[PDB]
Swiss-Prot record:
The modification Phosphoserine is found at S50, S242, S243. The lineage of its organism: Eukaryota, Metazoa, Chordata, Craniata, Vertebrata. It is a peripheral membrane protein. Residues 3-277 form the Tyrosine-protein phosphatase domain. The chain holds residues 1 to 299 of 435 of the full protein. The gene is PTPN1. The modification Cysteine persulfide is found at C215. It catalyses: O-phospho-L-tyrosyl-[protein] + H2O = L-tyrosyl-[protein] + phosphate. One of its GO terms (molecular function) is cadherin binding. Substrate binds at D181, C215, S216, A217, G218, I219, G220, R221, Q262. It comes from Homo sapiens. Tyrosine-protein phosphatase which acts as a regulator of endoplasmic reticulum unfolded protein response. Mediates dephosphorylation of EIF2AK3/PERK; inactivating the protein kinase activity of EIF2AK3/PERK. May play an important role in CKII- and p60c-src-induced signal transduction cascades. May regulate the EFNA5-EPHA3 signaling pathway which modulates cell reorganization and cell-cell repulsion. May also regulate the hepatocyte growth factor receptor signaling pathway through dephosphorylation of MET. This is Tyrosine-protein phosphatase non-receptor type 1.
Length: 299
């Protein structure tokens, strides 16, 4: 793999920080005017993280269609993702409205509600079957149906009901619970296993709306997740690990949302994930059970 070669070259010459800065320098810059309107200040978690106007998700409501979320639409890979910030105490109804209107099947969460002693996200889904949530502002009902807790992630089945029409949908919630507080996993196996668990659920598929992916800001781990998935998909579509330029893929993604992949560690890790996941893609179907062997169940 030309990327495994580039990988070793970048490591040998210790130039990940400089490579990453090259990415920052070249990335698209597009206006974020709607995000910056005074009426929307309380709809944003970080003042430095905003959806571009051209790719933002619009709520289908009359009074204020703003949510901090971007449609990342990858043409060649034929895959779409919504990246959004972790919902705020006042935007949880907006978040579920978006899930409803965009017809999403999966929600992928890559952070813990509390990290480094601070609240990175609101508790936007019910933790107990018998305590459903009602979002009055967007008229939606949300019910925990079942959980399945594994060592490094949790899968939840939720039922989202439009209280207006009374239609209901099954949403799958994929919660990666063990992203380290300060660095990156440094072994991709559990990340890959988690990714493939998401893929197997059908959440990433064309017959559904785009999967919603979020961390705290929706660019760091979120970017890593989408970048790896798209690179693997592309390698798959031409069975050719060589034509896939990950840096070009990132950057293509940065046309749709700023700041995707927050540091050189996450960049390096992205290569690792893609390189390792390429073993599966290329015919070695048994590498998936090896990733699961080094994972599944332990806190």
């Amino acid at each position: 793999m030309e990327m495994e070669k580039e990988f070793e070259q970048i490591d040998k010459s210790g130039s990940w920080a400089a490579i990453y800065q090259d990415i920052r320098h070249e990335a698209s810059d597009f206006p974020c005017r709607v995000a910056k309107l005074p009426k929307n200040k309380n709809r944003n978690r970080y003042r430095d993280v905003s959806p571009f106007d051209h790719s933002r998700i619009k709520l289908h409501q009359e009074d204020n269609d703003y949510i901090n979320a971007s449609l990342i639409k990858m043409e060649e890979a034929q895959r779409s993702y919504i990246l959004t910030q972790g919902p705020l105490p006042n935007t949880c109804g907006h978040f579920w409205e978006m899930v409803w209107e965009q017809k999403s099947r999966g929600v992928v969460m890559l952070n813990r509600v509390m990290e480094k002693g601070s609240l990175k996200c609101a508790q936007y889904w019910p933790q107990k079957e018998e305590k459903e949530m009602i979002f009055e502002d967007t008229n939606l009902k949300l019910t925990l149906i079942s959980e399945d807790i594994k060592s490094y992630y949790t899968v939840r089945q939720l039922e989202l009901e439009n209280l207006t029409t009374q239609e209901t949908r099954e949403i799958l919630h994929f919660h990666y619970t063990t992203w380290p507080d300060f660095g990156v996993p440094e072994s991709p196996a559990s990340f890959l296993n988690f990714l493939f668990k998401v893929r197997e659920s059908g959440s990433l598929s064309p017959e559904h709306g785009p999967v919603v992916v979020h961390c705290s800001a929706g660019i760091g781990r979120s970017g890593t997740f989408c970048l790896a998935d798209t690179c693997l998909l592309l390698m798959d579509k031409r069975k050719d690990p060589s034509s896939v330029d990950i840096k070009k893929v990132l950057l293509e993604m940065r046309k749709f949302r700023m700041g995707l992949i927050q540091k050189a560690d996450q960049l390096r890790f992205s290569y690792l994930a893609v390189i390792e996941g390429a073993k599966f893609i290329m015919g070695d179907s048994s590498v998936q059970d090896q990733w699961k062997e080094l994972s599944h169940e332990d806190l």
